[PDB]
RNA sequence: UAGCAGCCAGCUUAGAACUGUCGCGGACCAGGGGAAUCCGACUGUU
RNA sequence: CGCUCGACCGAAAGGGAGUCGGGUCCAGAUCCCCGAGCCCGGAGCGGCGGAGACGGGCGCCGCGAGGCGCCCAGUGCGGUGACGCAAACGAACCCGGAGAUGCCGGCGGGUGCCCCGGGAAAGAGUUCUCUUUUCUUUGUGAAGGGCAGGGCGCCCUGGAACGGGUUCGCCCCGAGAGAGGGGCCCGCGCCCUGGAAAGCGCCGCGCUUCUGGCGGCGUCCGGUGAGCUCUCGUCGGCCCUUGAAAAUCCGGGGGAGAAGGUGUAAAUCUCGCGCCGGGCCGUACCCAUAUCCGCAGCAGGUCUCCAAGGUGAACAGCCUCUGGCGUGUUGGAACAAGGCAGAGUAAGGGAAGUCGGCAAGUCAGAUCCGUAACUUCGGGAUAAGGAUUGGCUCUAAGGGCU
RNA sequence: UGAACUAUGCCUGGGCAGGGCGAAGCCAGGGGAAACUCUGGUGGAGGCCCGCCGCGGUCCUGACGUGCAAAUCGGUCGUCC
């Protein structure tokens, strides 16, 4: 809510950075190995808690 | 904000050492002395017009004065 | 409504709350009382009723007389 | 005719969340939250049922800031006692310290 | 107490003339619920050179003129070509979009 | 002195004439009723 | 110096000092900018001003305005009173007040909204005919000063039966009414400071990424109402229901103490003003027929605030303005059967249908009449059973003010 | 390991149009020899009545029944100081 303490905006702050696509030079890094994050969530279809 | 009445009451409360600035505003009626203080705002509202220009020299010098028209 | 000022589309068919419900009966009593004994101390005043007569009339006008 | 809203987090009528509409120079109608209304002091005697005379009727705190005479009258019990209670209180005292001479 | 009507754009652009328009207001002025004779000799219109004064001892509140004289033009079928503004105060011009 | 004059102000009630194709709570809103038997008194609850 | 002291946690709807007006962004806002305040904390000089500070009694200089010595005062003052004055010392301890009391009903004061009257001003709409017409806009913050208005078992004088005063209802009076004169409290209403410079409305000119700026005028005069809400009061009703604690703040009692010896001192509830400081955390948005939960953009579920015009008893139903929307996970062409629904309609008969009047049909508002058996006397009852209802033109009755 | 659903209790808050019958108390006018009675008005009582929001879920054994929904939808209906 608007209303948050701070350790669970503290939380939300880290899910959110770690919800960014991956890097585009770590694809041809890689080889097209890594290709997507398979760790991307949604906030309509995978809640956090 | 305070309203003075007496014009020997707003030149004592123009000379104090947190007089900001004088505003002077020029109306249909009359012609009032806003001086800025430290906490209220004194206005002195002169509804004559020839005492106003005998006030308005009457201020001590080295208060910044802004005649609002 | 200019013409139901002149009693125009009030009639009885163009009615359908219960008449204390039109003009409630205890607002009628209330505006009444006020007019009478506002003109019973007003007699009093102008002396044209002494007290006696006022008190015995007040209590005529509080039963409904 | 508008439709206002609240200006706080709070959207309960509480007995904190009171307002009132006051028209704003920019020819508006917000609301303005209001101070819950003070009461005047009651008279020590626990029988006058009337509150006292002389006394601002504000909040507790609000007191801290009123200057003296705006908190008790020039009497004897003044601020804590009624006038009628503390004129009764004068005659008792001498009405009893005087059968107690009587005795003796 | 007293109003006047500028029309002089439109009668400088041969639109409209202030010979008709005058004799327009002299059978529309409601004056006491009538329109005839302007209530007698208490309402009298003036005409000048493209400019009316109309002068009467009731109020005769002046948007009346304004209600008439675009009651005028919509008559004359140039509504849509002049506009009914108030320049300065007792007046009425008539002005182009 | 069995009170009058001037001015202002609404909203209701009652009666009457006339009138339309006897239609008028014209849409909307809005209890079918009566005589009896069984069980539980009633309101409430599941 | 300390018994009420037994740590501490526990409310983003309880208690809880103090921020409001205008403007600004692609998204922020009582937080930013501008303007105007306020509260709390801080001071051996706490920085000034004022209060505490009012002087008397004996001799002389003296025919004087005043000046010399001693002695004695002075921790404010006014009013019969309620109580009022800018301040107006005061410990331990004690007492009390506020914080801090339910639900319901009636009435009154004030705002907001709605409505009415200006043959009001500024734009717009309509004009085929009529329409001095129709629609929109007409403003003031917190804080302080003043005054209406409301309330008061508050004071003084006085004295009551032929009892009087008084409310919609009540209630009030020799434990002292009525009347006359005062005091206090609430004032969120009005005037003023703020404050028109700003905000809206209209008009003109300049300008097209400094341009995205400058000017003019206006912001008016009244009315009430069984109107609707909110709020402040006040009088009641109900209970085998009595409808919170604490932080915090204040007053009084108390007179332990402190202050100086003739002009000041102690002390000052800012007492007029000035000086400094106010850290940490939350703050975007959705809040629901697509931002929550139900596996989803799920006809479900989820706590509240604001709330207009007409008809009407209505916050019912139907229609409209502000605001919002494209018909709710799709378009097009047909109108067969059979379904769901419109509670569609129907000749004559009217429950013969069926386990059964299931289904829906009749009745329905309001006014005026008229209402049995039975009963715990409260009821039954809108019993049952009749009449009236539109539109239009009039008449009669019900008010206020001078 | 669970009282984010639900059952009961406690603390602290919020909410419940418009109408109807109309009880005690009170005023007035009549009857009385007293006991005490009658009419009108007032008043606004109630696990009172019609009824909106709310809260419930009767009937159609309607719709739906690989549904909008692992219990919902429509009319009707109970209650609403
Ligand atoms: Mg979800
Ligand atoms: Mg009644
Ligand atoms: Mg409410
Ligand atoms: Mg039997
Ligand atoms: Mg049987
Ligand atoms: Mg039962
Ligand atoms: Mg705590
Ligand atoms: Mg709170
Ligand atoms: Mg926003
Ligand atoms: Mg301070
Ligand atoms: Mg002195
Ligand atoms: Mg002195
Ligand atoms: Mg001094
Ligand atoms: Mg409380
Ligand atoms: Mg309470
Ligand atoms: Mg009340
Ligand atoms: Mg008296
Ligand atoms: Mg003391
Ligand atoms: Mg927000
Ligand atoms: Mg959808
Ligand atoms: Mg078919
Ligand atoms: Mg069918
Ligand atoms: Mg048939
Ligand atoms: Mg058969
Ligand atoms: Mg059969
Ligand atoms: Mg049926
Ligand atoms: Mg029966
Ligand atoms: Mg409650
Ligand atoms: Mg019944
Ligand atoms: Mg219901
Ligand atoms: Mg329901
Ligand atoms: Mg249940
Ligand atoms: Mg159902
Ligand atoms: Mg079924
Ligand atoms: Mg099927
Ligand atoms: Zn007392």
Request: charged letters at 35%; glycine letters at 4%; proline letters at 3%.
């Given at each position: 809510?608007?209303?948050?303490?701070?350790?669970?905006?503290?939380?939300?702050?880290?899910?959110?950075?770690?919800?960014?696509?991956?890097?585009?030079?770590?694809?041809?890094?890689?080889?097209?190995?890594?290709?997507?994050?398979?760790?991307?969530?949604?906030?309509?279809?995978?809640?956090?808690? | 904000?305070?309203?003075?009445?007496?014009?020997?009451?707003?030149?004592?409360?123009?000379?104090?050492?947190?007089?900001?600035?004088?505003?002077?505003?020029?109306?249909?009626?009359?012609?009032?002395?806003?001086?800025?203080?430290?906490?209220?705002?004194?206005?002195?509202?002169?509804?004559?017009?020839?005492?106003?220009?005998?006030?308005?020299?009457?201020?001590?010098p080295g208060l910044a004065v802004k005649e609002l028209k | 409504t200019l013409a139901r000022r002149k009693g125009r589309h009030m009639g009885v068919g163009k009615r359908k709350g219960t008449a204390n419900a039109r003009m409630p009966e205890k607002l009628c009593w209330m505006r009444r009382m006020r007019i009478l004994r506002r003109l019973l101390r007003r007699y009093r005043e102008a002396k044209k009723i002494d007290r006696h007569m006022y008190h015995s009339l007040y209590l005529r006008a509080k039963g409904n007389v | 005719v508008?439709?206002?809203?609240?200006?706080?987090?709070?959207?309960?009528?509480?007995?904190?969340?009171?307002?009132?509409?006051?028209?704003?120079?920019?020819?508006?109608?917000?609301?303005?939250?209001?101070?819950?209304?003070?009461?005047?002091?009651?008279?020590?005697?626990?029988?006058?049922?009337?509150?006292?005379?002389?006394?601002?009727?504000?909040?507790?705190?609000?007191?801290?800031?009123?200057?003296?005479?705006?908190?008790?009258?020039?009497?004897?019990?003044?601020?804590?006692?009624?006038?009628?209670?503390?004129?009764?209180?004068?005659?008792?005292?001498?009405?009893?310290?005087?059968?107690?001479?009587?005795?003796? | 107490?007293?109003?006047?009507?500028?029309?002089?754009?439109?009668?400088?652009?041969?639109?409209?003339?202030?010979?008709?328009?005058?004799?327009?207001?002299?059978?529309?002025?409601?004056?006491?619920?009538?329109?005839?004779?302007?209530?007698?000799?208490?309402?009298?219109?003036?005409?000048?050179?493209?400019?009316?004064?109309?002068?009467?001892?009731?109020?005769?509140?002046?948007?009346?003129?304004?209600?008439?004289?675009?009651?005028?033009?919509?008559?004359?079928?140039?509504?849509?070509?002049?506009?009914?503004?108030?320049?300065?105060?007792?007046?009425?011009?008539?002005?182009?979009?």
């Open positions: 809510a608007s209303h948050k303490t701070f350790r669970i905006k503290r939380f939300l702050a880290k899910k959110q950075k770690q919800n960014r696509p991956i890097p585009q030079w770590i694809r041809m890094k890689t080889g097209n190995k890594i290709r997507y994050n398979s760790k991307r969530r949604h906030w309509r279809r995978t809640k956090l808690g | 904000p305070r309203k003075i009445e007496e014009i020997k009451d707003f030149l004592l409360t123009a000379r104090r050492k947190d007089a900001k600035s004088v505003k002077i505003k020029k109306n249909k009626d009359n012609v009032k002395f806003k001086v800025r203080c430290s906490r209220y705002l004194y206005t002195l509202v002169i509804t004559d017009k020839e005492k106003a220009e005998k006030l308005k020299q009457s201020l001590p | - | 508008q439709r206002l809203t609240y200006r706080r987090r709070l959207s309960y009528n509480t007995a904190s969340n009171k307002t009132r509409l006051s028209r704003t120079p920019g020819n508006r109608i917000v609301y303005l939250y209001t101070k819950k209304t003070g009461k005047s002091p009651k008279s020590a005697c626990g029988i006058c049922p009337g509150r006292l005379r002389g006394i601002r009727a504000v909040r507790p705190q609000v007191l801290m800031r009123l200057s003296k005479t705006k908190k008790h009258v020039s009497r004897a019990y003044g601020g804590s006692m009624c006038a009628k209670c503390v004129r009764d209180r004068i005659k008792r005292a001498f009405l009893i310290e005087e059968q107690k001479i009587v005795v003796k | 107490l007293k109003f006047t009507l500028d029309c002089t754009h439109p009668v400088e652009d041969g639109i409209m003339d202030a010979a008709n328009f005058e004799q327009f207001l002299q059978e529309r002025i409601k004056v006491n619920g009538k329109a005839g004779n302007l209530g007698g000799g208490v309402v009298s219109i003036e005409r000048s050179k493209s400019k009316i004064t109309v002068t009467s001892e009731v109020p005769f509140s002046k948007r009346y003129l304004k209600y008439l004289t675009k009651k005028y033009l919509k008559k004359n079928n140039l509504r849509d070509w002049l506009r009914v503004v108030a320049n300065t105060k007792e007046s009425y011009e008539l002005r182009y979009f």
